[PDB]
Design a protein around this ligand. Structure first.
Ligand code: FMN
Ligand code: URA
Length: 338
């Protein structure tokens, strides 16, 4: 048994950088239709990223992005079962605001909300608004996040923080109400420091799936995450990001995938700088018939450490539909559902 989440397209064209991919703006209403459909098929959770700058090109890839906390507050108000995670880009929001936003969406969702904390990698995302802390930051970002999360822990735990460190000073800082349920914190650290951070403070860790149709290729990463979690004695499983390109037969899925790679938007792709393709940022990709994708996802579920998968689709509305109608009923690790 394995948890499934949907990575909601808060950015235009989702995760495909291609003139042959579906072209779409991220709107509330689309994300709404996506999450209500995921929920209908008993997806366990929905997460949006935050992305403050695009990559340009013919497709203007990720030039158009909604903001994660307000989007997930809206989706919380129109759902009732699915878990909801927003991403805080920690350089952009003071911890006490994040603490109170999380409490607010706790209230909207009736205890279904959590937070994905990220340090921020993309210097231009922060440079553009004059808030990059210098090149000190690459090396020091995990100390920063350590202080940040301590402030949140105090606020969610007791309503109050006196935390004092290098980057934050609380003087009897107050946030009430406190979340109705223990606030879940997720992290996406791949590095050593990142995994050490997650081992100490996260409920689980997002990592990248690897290769095309090589479902268990990420297994070493999940092994290191599991090793990091032994060092704190805490249960911090891996959730693995894959793109699913599924169809009636393997041939048809492969034709879609090739069709996408053909239209690659090379102009957008320069700004980012059986093989994985940059057309989906070299994402772990599963391409096949419904049954073949079911089988490969079953393999992911057997990797030590792996507690779930976070899924993108080439086409979200019909991809979630076919996943739910054709893939999920064939998956051993989902036989527990209605
Ligand atoms: C599921 C997933 C979601 C992510 N979401 C974001 C995001 O919203 N914003 C962002 O700047 N980075 C995001 N990242 C990038 C990660 O934080 C990245 O793995 C990390 O920066 C590299 O690991 P390190 O920080 O330990 O070096 C995401 C990564 C994964 C795997
Ligand atoms: O910043 C981001 C968001 C989604 N996927 C990535 O690889 N990076």
């Amino acid at each position: 048994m394995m948890k499934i989440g949907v990575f909601v397209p808060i950015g235009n064209n989702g995760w495909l950088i291609s003139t042959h991919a579906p072209q779409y703006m991220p709107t509330f209403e689309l994300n709404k239709a996506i999450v209500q459909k995921a929920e209908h098929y008993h997806f366990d959770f929905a997460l949006s990223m935050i992305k403050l700058r695009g990559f340009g090109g013919k497709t203007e890839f990720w030039d158009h992005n909604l903001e994660s906390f307000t989007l997930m507050a809206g989706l919380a108000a129109v759902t009732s079962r699915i878990q909801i995670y927003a991403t805080a880009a920690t350089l952009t929001l003071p911890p006490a605001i994040v603490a109170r936003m999380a409490a607010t969406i706790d209230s909207i969702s009736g205890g279904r909300f959590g937070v994905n904390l990220v340090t921020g990698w993309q210097k231009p995302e922060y440079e553009q608004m004059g808030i990059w802390p210098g090149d000190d930051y690459f090396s020091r970002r995990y100390d920063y996040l350590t202080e940040y999360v301590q402030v949140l822990r105090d606020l969610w735990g007791t309503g109050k923080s006196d935390f004092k460190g290098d980057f934050f000073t609380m003087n009897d800082c107050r946030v009430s109400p406190q979340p109705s349920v223990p606030m879940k914190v997720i992290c996406a650290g791949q590095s050593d420091a990142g995994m050490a951070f997650s081992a100490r403070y996260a409920d689980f860790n997002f990592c990248f799936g690897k290769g095309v149709n090589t479902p268990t290729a990420f297994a070493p990463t999940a092994a290191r995450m599991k090793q990091a979690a032994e060092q704190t004695g805490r249960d911090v499983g891996s959730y693995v990001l894959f793109m699913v390109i599924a169809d009636e037969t393997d041939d048809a899925a492969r034709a879609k995938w090739e069709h996408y790679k053909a239209g690659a938007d090379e102009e957008a792709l320069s700004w980012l700088t059986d093989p994985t393709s940059a057309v989906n940022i070299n994402m772990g990709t599963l391409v096949g018939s419904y049954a073949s994708v079911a089988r490969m996802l079953d393999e992911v579920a057997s990797v030590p450490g792996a507690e779930g998968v976070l899924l993108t689709f080439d086409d979200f509305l019909s991809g979630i539909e076919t996943f739910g109608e054709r893939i999920q009923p064939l998956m051993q690790c989902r036989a527990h559902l209605p």
